[PDB]
């Protein structure tokens, strides 16, 4: 009977950085995905492992909403079988991904004339991320054989970098708020159904 708090995830005042993406489990509610369309035209509304015409006529054990902020030229990485700094080092989707990716422009909220600093992304990693893995480790990246001793320098780079979102950037470099809706099926009674049951 209760509606799923999808609006709370999309209407957050400040979104999380991609290296430290947020996650909320949606459970025991009616999932009417029309509530999210109060958020303007979407730059991307792509679903995988599921029929988009069935999004309001399906029951699942749980639904997961992962939210973060990337550049425009990086939204294509939030998809199964993709490469790049976001997919390799920040947020990785599995090949058998069952869900939808929803991205909209946030230049008017996530950019300042001086340059947004809190929105950061990981630039270096010794290995690619596993699907749905999260890396918040803040160690200096040792590119060579010489240890780094905890300070950046030659062949020793800080792993996290800021976007520096300014309003006068091109749309490819402007901030975009992404929400990844994950549909979970386990051998357990379903707690999230659509309005059409």
């Amino acid at each position: 009977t209760n509606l799923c708090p999808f609006h709370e995830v999309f209407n957050a005042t400040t979104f999380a950085s991609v290296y430290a993406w947020n996650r909320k489990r949606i459970s025991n509610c009616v999932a009417d995905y029309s509530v999210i369309y109060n958020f303007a035209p979407f730059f991307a509304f792509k679903c995988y492992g599921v029929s988009p015409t069935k999004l309001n006529d399906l029951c699942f054990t749980n639904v997961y909403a992962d939210s973060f902020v990337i550049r425009g030229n990086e939204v294509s990485q939030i998809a199964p079988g993709q490469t790049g700094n976001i997919a390799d080092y920040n947020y990785k989707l599995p090949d058998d991904f069952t869900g939808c990716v929803i991205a909209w422009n946030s230049n008017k909220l996530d950019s300042t004339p001086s340059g947004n600093y809190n929105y950061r992304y990981r630039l270096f990693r010794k290995s690619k991320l596993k699907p749905f893995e999260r890396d918040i480790s803040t160690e200096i990246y040792q590119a060579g054989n010489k240890p780094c001793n905890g300070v950046a320098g030659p062949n020793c780079y800080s792993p996290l970098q800021s976007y520096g979102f300014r309003p006068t950037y091109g749309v490819g470099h402007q901030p975009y708020r992404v929400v990844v809706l994950s549909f979970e099926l386990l051998h357990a009674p379903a707690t999230v159904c659509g309005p059409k049951k």
Partner: antibody
Amino acid sequence: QVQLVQSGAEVKKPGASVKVSCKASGYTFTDYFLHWVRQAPGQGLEWMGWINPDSGGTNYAQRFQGRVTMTRDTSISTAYMEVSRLRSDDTAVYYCARDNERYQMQNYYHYYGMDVWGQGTTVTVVS
Amino acid sequence: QSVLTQPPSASGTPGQRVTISCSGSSSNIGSNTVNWYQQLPGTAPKLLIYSNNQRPSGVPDRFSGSKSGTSASLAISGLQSEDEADYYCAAWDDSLNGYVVFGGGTKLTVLG
């Protein structure tokens, strides 16, 4: 008070069974996985498995697959650990520890640590 | 199944910096994050480090974690008498169905 309180000490004979309780409070019981770690006297820590209290799914260590059953009771926010065919080698302190990553997906699990720990339940196997 | 190798013992005088190594393989430390625990006598383990170098809320900044290859290391700078305890490393091992591997533990003795 985010807390894990376990049942009292147990003394059993070899071959018998024991069921240890682990009650959670101060947080949503189904948000976090629960681990089971035991420690023989004077020995190190040994991982026994995790259980997802949201679904009941488990992942036992290979050494305990067959003699150990983990269950949940969301009604009273209590996790149970039952060991069958108790050996003298099972005499140890049994801990329940909370998985420190919220909202895990069972089929895409990632272990990052155990933040909340219970006081332990002593199990002594003597004849 | 796997074994994370720690030095059996380690010592240091008050105020010094002590390091405790944790040697694993490619399927545990080389593939996953490393977390560290402190265990006082007659006490349940306490999380000191997680996600390689992150400290939980309330863990003093004199504790430091690091990961490199298939090895990890815990550093206790500004050693105090209260730091005398057993210290464990742990990491997920991707082998088989997956399992948490605890190190053998290292007993820290604050001399002086």
